[PDB]
Structure 1
């Protein structure tokens, strides 16, 4: 559909477009310049250092962010196979209320809810047989 626009502009010689902003460097620059209204960050990024600094940067710049599952999902959002990040910067008047409500919902459900728990270490899980052996040892030590 881009070619449909270029032919139309050639005949005249177009309104202001609204689109999802994507690209890691572009989105990081938008966050640093405080232009991004909302940021979505994919959780399954390898190497992870590409996005491991994004929540702290968004928190420092006061940009609402949400970690979502699926770089493939963000890629379908931006017409790619994968996308590490997506950003909403400018929205239409028919969707400004929806965007504000979504920002409030993310603030209630993701930022405030996971504020404490994200400061803790993860991966404290044993294997199945090790857990069974530890449970048996604890039961035997507590009661004969």
Structure 2
């Protein structure tokens, strides 16, 4: 979730949704990098597992799909940002109450 420039991955959720590939936006390119012996990986993927992990992969894919791909159509419609700072937010909610 913290790649710079973000252009490198910003199309990945769309591509995964288009291609039917389950994806999760996850905290840490450093965390991804430590599981591939790098400082930073920016992406990780499983193309196949062993039988002893197929059920764990299936259940985790189901939870990850419920969190990312199944929300993709709604998340695509909503703008982030527009959040105020501490002082501006205070001075906004006092005028919401006052008038």
Structure 1: gaps (5+ residues): 1-42
Q: Following the alignment from structure 1 to structure 2, what is the Cα–Cα distance between the partners of residues 77 and 121?
A: 33
Distance 2:75 2:94 in 1: 30
TM-score where L is the length of structure 2: 0.88
Structure 1 residues 113 and 68: alpha-carbon distance in aligned structure 2, compared to 1, 3 A threshold: same
Post-superposition shift, 1:113?
Answer: 5.0
The runs of at least 4 consecutive aligned structure 1 residues that moved more than 6 Å come to: none
CA-to-aligned-CA distance 1:74-117 (integer Å, 9 cap, x gap)? 00111100111000011111111111111112122333356524
Gaps in structure 2 of 5+ consecutive residues: none
- The whole-number CA distance in structure 1 between the counterparts of 2:28 and 2:52 is 28
Larger radius of gyration: 1
Of Structure 1 and Structure 2, the greater strand share is in 1
Count of matched residue pairs:
99
Measure, in 1, the Cα distance between the counterparts of 2:26 and 2:69: 13
Q: Distance in 2 between matches of 1:117 and 1:56?
A: 11
CA distance in 2, matches of 1:116, 1:64: 17
Classify 1:61/1:115 alpha carbon distance in 2 versus 1 (closer, same or farther; 3 Å).
same
Residues 102 and 74 (structure 1), Cα distance of their counterparts in 2 relative to 1, 3 Å cut: same
The CA RMSD measured in Å over matched residues stands at 1.7
Matched residue SS, 1:60: helix
- Cα distance in 2 for partners of 1:95, 1:88 equals 11
User: What TM-score results when the alignment is normalised by the length of structure 1?
Assistant: 0.62
Does 68-77 or 97-106 show the bigger shift?
97-106
1:24-54 residue CA offsets vs partner (Å, 9 max, x unmatched): xxxxxxxxxxxxxxxxxxx000000000110
